[PDB]
Amino acid sequence: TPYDPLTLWTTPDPPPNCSLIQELDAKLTLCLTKNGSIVNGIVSLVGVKGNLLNIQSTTTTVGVHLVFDEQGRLITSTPTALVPQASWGYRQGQSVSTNTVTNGLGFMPNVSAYPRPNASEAKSQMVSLTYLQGDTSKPITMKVAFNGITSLNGYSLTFMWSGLSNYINQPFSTPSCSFSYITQE
Amino acid sequence: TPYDPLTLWTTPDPPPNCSLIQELDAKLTLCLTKNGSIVNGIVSLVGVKGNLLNIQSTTTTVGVHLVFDEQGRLITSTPTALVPQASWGYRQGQSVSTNTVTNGLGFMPNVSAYPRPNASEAKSQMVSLTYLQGDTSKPITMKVAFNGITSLNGYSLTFMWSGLSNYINQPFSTPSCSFSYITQE
Amino acid sequence: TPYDPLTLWTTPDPPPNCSLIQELDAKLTLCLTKNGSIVNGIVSLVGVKGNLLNIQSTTTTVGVHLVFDEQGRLITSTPTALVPQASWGYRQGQSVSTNTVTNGLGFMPNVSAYPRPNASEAKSQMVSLTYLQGDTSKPITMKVAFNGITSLNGYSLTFMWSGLSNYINQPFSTPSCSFSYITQE
């Protein structure tokens, strides 16, 4: 079965794939679909190691950066959460095609609408209230910023879940969380 | 084709079509639209009979499940909310098509991404903070769960609204609630 | 076909196109993408002149209306926030096409789902918690009402950010906010 050019993801159930604090200490599920000038996306993050399994007082916020180049290609180089060997790309069945992204701009956040320097402007963010573990008694905040950590010629997505301190010695895991944005192309 | 193979709804303004506590006590308006690997969803529930008109001290939550067979076809028997006489199929103008769903899996929550056993797992859930009757002064939580009330080959969607206990004798009407999930196929 | 007949926006980085409190005192960024029976929209508003830079103790709500006609076309007169000169049409490159919208209704809110004499009805409203300036400590709400200010034959989209009164002397800015709804056609 062919791959889907409107869909980039990390596969429905990735093995640990992000080294946020320690090696492969988090399991990141990310699906980005292109719906015309808008990409509808869903993300989830569950800790499997260290502080992610047991939030410390310093684990105030958990975040993941995904840096893209001028053509919208993910750069595994740090600060990119995804390890340079984890699967990321076009959906193909329950897996990821080996074809390189040739329509990445259609997946990158529009710089005109979201400038590379203006990573602090309100509009370069979509903010929501969600719950830790899915429990309505453990609220936290998910900030998603665009082009907030680029490279003069590239793109990015950042995910920040704040308000954790209140939940020390508790596993960090978010529900399936949605977000959307205007595409560069 | 006279219909939209990419949409399955209950029609825009359906009559009572659910029996949550007593027979036909609620109107469910549901639209599921597929775009690649994701389904955008909008749901709305308006109580019309019994406890749904007047919330009781013990009425703490209000939910509706929807179970599907191994081919994404809705099974209209408990615990499914929508009754046998209810409209449900692909959009065709303002009505539903009588054609059977040949692409049901395309609208089902991914079992790999949302396991049958792991229903309590934060990932199998999209939760938020919505408001009763669309009143910002009356916040209530909503939790959409994927595949937590299935039957080995089946699939399901579950909508739970809680924190209602503090609105005794008020009518139960939710605002239009958005949601989404990674599809099976 | 250079433009995209599935997107209706105001281009990504538009000049002040709103005169909410005083002339051209606010920039409104709006993108509506059609994905079958549902539309995925992203709203964004920032104040640049007058009271919008300093929230008053009585200013609990700040908002804009967009009124369309029988064919889903924008009426640049009151109550429509967007001034006559403001860019608005099909996305073409980073600008807008000159082609008159020939399918406005596919972007309009379904009147059967969202009735005119029912703007108050919970269903005719999608509500969420968001944050002023995108500051996770400055929560507020956004209400998107469907067909609440029309012309019997018209359609509309009303966005109202509230819970601002307790932020006096602060510049009004909102993050990019998501919303969606069932289409007429």
Dihedral sign for Cα atoms in the order C28, C170, C138, C119: negative
Which residues of chain C have a CB within 8 Å of the CB of B41?
A: 38
Q: Cα(B145)–Cα(A31) distance, rounded to whole angstroms?
A: 18
- DSSP secondary structure string for all residues of B129-160: EEEGGG-TTSEEEEEEEESSS--TT-EEEEEE
d(CA B113, CA A176) in angstroms, rounded, equals 10
Contacts of A102 (CB under 8 A, 6+ apart): none
Sheet containing strand C61-69, strands side by side: C73-74, C61-69, C155-162, C139-146, C125-131
What is the DSSP code (8-state) at residue B16? -
Cβ-based neighbour number of residue C12 at 10 Å:
23
Nearest residue to A4 (alpha-carbon basis) of A74, A97, A73, A88: A97
Please give the CATH superfamily to which domain A1-185 belongs: Adenovirus pIV-related, attachment domain (2.60.90.10)
CA torsion sign, B129 to C111 to B25 to B92?
negative
Cβ-contact B76, B86 below 8 angstroms: yes
Neighbours of B162 (CB within 10 A): 15
d(CA C28, CA C139): 20
Q: Do A125 and C31 touch (CB under 8 A)?
A: no
The residue extents of the domains of chain C are: 1-185
Kindly write down the DSSP assignment for every residue of chain C, as one continuous string.
--SEEEEEE--SS----B-SSSTT-EEEEEEEEEETTEEEEEEEEEE-SGGGGS--TT--EEEEEEEEETTTEE--STTBSS-TTS--EEEETTEE--SPPS-GGGTSBPTTTS-GGGTTSGGGEEEEEEEGGG-TTSEEEEEEEESSS--SS-EEEEEEEE--GGGTT---B---EEEEEEB--
Rounded to an integer, what distance in angstroms lies between the CA atom of residue A64 and that of residue A41? 15
Angle at A101 between CA A95 and CA A106, to 5 degrees: 110
C136: left (phi over 0), alpha (psi -120 to 50) or beta: alpha
Residues in contact with C166: Cβ distance below 8 Å, sequence separation at least 6, in sequence order = none
Take residue C182 and report the two structure tokens written for it.
Answer: 């069932």
Q: Which residues, in sequence order, are CB contacts of B142 under 8 Å at separation 6+?
A: B127, B128, B129, B130, B159, B160, B161, B174, B177
Q: Is C6 on the interface with A (CB under 8 A)?
A: yes
Q: For residues C68 and C154, what is the distance between their CA atoms, to the nearest angstrom? A: 6
- Chains in contact with B, where contact means 3 or more Cβ–Cβ distances below 8 Å, are A, C
Phi, psi at residue A120, to the nearest 5°? Answer: -105, -5
The amino acid that residue B49 corresponds to is K
Q: Contact, C139 vs B139, CB < 8 A?
A: no
Report the DSSP pairing between strands A26-35 and A38-47.
antiparallel
* First CA to last CA distance, chain C: 22
* 8 Å CB contact of B139 and C129: yes
Best of B34, B108, B127 to disrupt the A interface by mutation (most A CBs within 10 Å)? B127
Q: How many residues does chain C have?
A: 185
Dist CA A103 CA B107 (whole Å): 25
Reduce the DSSP state of residue B25 to 3 states and report it. Answer: coil
Instruction: Name every chain C residue with its beta carbon within 8 A of the beta carbon of B94.
Output: 110, 112
Residues 142-161 of B with CB under 8 A from A: 143, 146
The single residue listed with the structure tokens 């602060």 is C170
Q: How does DSSP classify residue B82?
A: B
Q: Is C123 on the interface with B (CB under 8 A)?
A: yes
DSSP state at residue B171: -
Chain B positions in Cβ-Cβ contact with residue A174 (cut-off 8 Å): 122
Q: Which of C43, C53, C35 is nearest to C142 (CA)?
A: C43
Name every chain A residue with its beta carbon within 8 A of the beta carbon of C52: none
Structure letter (DSSP) for residue A11: -
- Tell me the C-alpha distance between A90 and A7, whole Å: 6
Q: Is B9 close to C37, i.e. CB distance below 8 A?
A: yes
Is residue A71 exposed (0-12), middle (13-18) or buried (19+ Cβ within 10 Å)? middle
CB atoms within 10 A of CB A73: 17
Separation CA A109–CA A156 (nearest Å): 7
A88 and chain B: CB distance < 8 Å anywhere? no
Closest CA to B133 of B165, B167, B178, B174: B174
How many angstroms away from the CA of C93 is the closest CA of chain A?
8
For residue C131, what are the β-bridge partners?
C139
